[PDB]
C-alpha cells in the first residue's frame, strides 16, 4: 500500500501538511489510481472541520491520465488556514463522479510548536 483513499486501489505518495500555506516543498508527490477509465482521476486536497469545507489549495488540484501522476506543485491550506483538518479527496473525471476520502485528516497549525 501507499497513502490510499477509500480503497487500496487508489494510492498516493505525499508528506504531512499539519500547518497553513504548505508551499512548494522539496518533498515532491505521486498518485496511482487502478481502474478501467481512459484517464486516471483528479486529486483535490480540501481542509475543513466536518462542518467548514474551506478547502483552500495552491495547485493541490491535480489530474491523472495513464492512471499515474508526477509533480511537486500541489499546495495544502493555500492562501492560509486555521483550526481545520486536511480532508484530502480524490474526485473522479467521468460521467459517474467517484469521490473518495483519505484515512486520517490531522488538524493544521497557524504558527507552530516553535520556530
Curated annotation (Swiss-Prot):
Effect of residue 47 to T: Loss of heterodimerization. Disrupts interactionof AML1-MTG8/ETO with CBFB, no effect on AML1-MTG8/ETO-mediated transformation activity
Species annotation: Homo sapiens (Human)
Effect in UniProt of substituting residue 23 to A: Strongly reduces DNA-binding
Record protein name field: Runt-related transcription factor 1
Binding locations of chloride 2: 79, 110
Comment block on domains: A proline/serine/threonine rich region at the C-terminus is necessary for transcriptional activation of target genes.
Impact after mutating residue 7 to R: Loss of heterodimerization and reduced EP300 phosphorylation induction
Outcome of substituting residue 24 to A: No effect on DNA binding
Effect of residue 48 to R: Loss of heterodimerization and impaired phosphorylation
Runt domain ranges (all copies): 1-115
UniProt-reported outcome of changing residue 80 to G: Disrupts AML1-MTG8/ETO DNA-binding, decreases AML1-MTG8/ETO transforming activity
Clinical note on disease: A chromosomal aberration involving RUNX1/AML1 is a cause of M2 type acute myeloid leukemia (AML-M2). Translocation t(8;21)(q22;q22) with RUNX1T1. A chromosomal aberration involving RUNX1/AML1 is a cause of therapy-related myelodysplastic syndrome (T-MDS). Translocation t(3;21)(q26;q22) with EAP or MECOM.
Name of the coding gene: RUNX1
Part of the full-length chain shown: 61 to 175 of 453
Effect on the protein of changing residue 20 to A: Strongly reduces DNA-binding
Post-translational modifications: Phosphorylated in its C-terminus upon IL-6 treatment. Phosphorylation enhances interaction with KAT6A.
Reported impact of residue 107 to A: Reduces DNA-binding
Induction: Up-regulated by phorbol myristate acetate (PMA).
Residues covered by region (Interaction with DNA): 20-24, 75-83, 108-115
Oligomer status and interactors: Heterodimer with CBFB. RUNX1 binds DNA as a monomer and through the Runt domain. DNA-binding is increased by heterodimerization. Isoform AML-1L can neither bind DNA nor heterodimerize. Interacts with TLE1 and ALYREF/THOC4. Interacts with ELF1, ELF2 and SPI1. Interacts via its Runt domain with the ELF4 N-terminal region. Interaction with ELF2 isoform 2 (NERF-1a) may act to repress RUNX1-mediated transactivation. Interacts with KAT6A and KAT6B. Interacts with SUV39H1, leading to abrogation of transactivating and DNA-binding properties of RUNX1. Interacts with YAP1. Interacts with HIPK2.
Expression sites (tissue/organ): Expressed in all tissues examined except brain and heart. Highest levels in thymus, bone marrow and peripheral blood.
Subcellular location(s) per record: Nucleus
Record-listed chloride 1 binding positions: 52, 56
Role description: Forms the heterodimeric complex core-binding factor (CBF) with CBFB. RUNX members modulate the transcription of their target genes through recognizing the core consensus binding sequence 5'-TGTGGT-3', or very rarely, 5'-TGCGGT-3', within their regulatory regions via their runt domain, while CBFB is a non-DNA-binding regulatory subunit that allosterically enhances the sequence-specific DNA-binding capacity of RUNX.
Amino acid at each position: 500500500e501507499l497513502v490510499r483513499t477509500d480503497s487500496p486501489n487508489f494510492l498516493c505518495s505525499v508528506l504531512p501538511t499539519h500547518w497553513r500555506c504548505n508551499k512548494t516543498l522539496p518533498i515532491a508527490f505521486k498518485v496511482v489510481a487502478l481502474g478501467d477509465v481512459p484517464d486516471g482521476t483528479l486529486v483535490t486536497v480540501m481542509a475543513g472541520n466536518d462542518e467548514n469545507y474551506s478547502a483552500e489549495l495552491r495547485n493541490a488540484t491535480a489530474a491523472m491520465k495513464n492512471q499515474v501522476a508526477r509533480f511537486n506543485d500541489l499546495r495544502f491550506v493555500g492562501r492560509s488556514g486555521r483550526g481545520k483538518s486536511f480532508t484530502l479527496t480524490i474526485t473522479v473525471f467521468t460521467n459517474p463522479p467517484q469521490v473518495a476520502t483519505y484515512h486520517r485528516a490531522i488538524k493544521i497549525t497557524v504558527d507552530g510548536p516553535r520556530e
